[PDB]
């Protein structure tokens, strides 16, 4: 195996010349992350190993 | 005086032999090799 910067697509290229897209409101996933942060369950170690 | 035929010194060789009654374990110098496991209270991956 080699570490060669596996690539994901940088942007959802939207087509259509008129209108608005269907992206989520800009404060929707931010409110979901904040709710998940409140549960304070983030896992960091697997048997002492990070 | 008793002259006796002996074995000439150049036709024999002393060879050191190491006699053991059993093969020592892997952690031979360890009294408790099971204390690395009994003290893994977070787990082992």
Automatic annotation (TrEMBL), chain B:
It comes from the Viruses. Residues 9-45 are annotated as: Disordered. Residues 11-21 have a biased composition (Basic and acidic residues). This is Coat protein. The chain holds residues 1192 to 1236 of 1240 of the full protein.
């Amino acid at each position: 195996y080699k570490e060669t910067s596996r690539v994901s697509l940088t942007s959802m290229i939207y087509v259509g010349t008129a209108g608005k897209d269907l992206s989520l409101p800009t404060g929707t996933v931010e409110d979901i992350i904040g709710a998940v942060d409140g549960m304070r369950r983030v896992v960091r170690t697997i048997g002492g190993q990070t | 005086i008793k002259t006796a035929p002996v074995v000439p010194p150049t036709e024999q060789r002393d060879m050191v032999q190491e006699e053991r009654v059993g093969t020592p374990v892997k952690n031979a110098g360890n009294a408790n090799p099971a204390a690395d496991s009994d003290n893994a209270t977070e787990g082992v991956v």
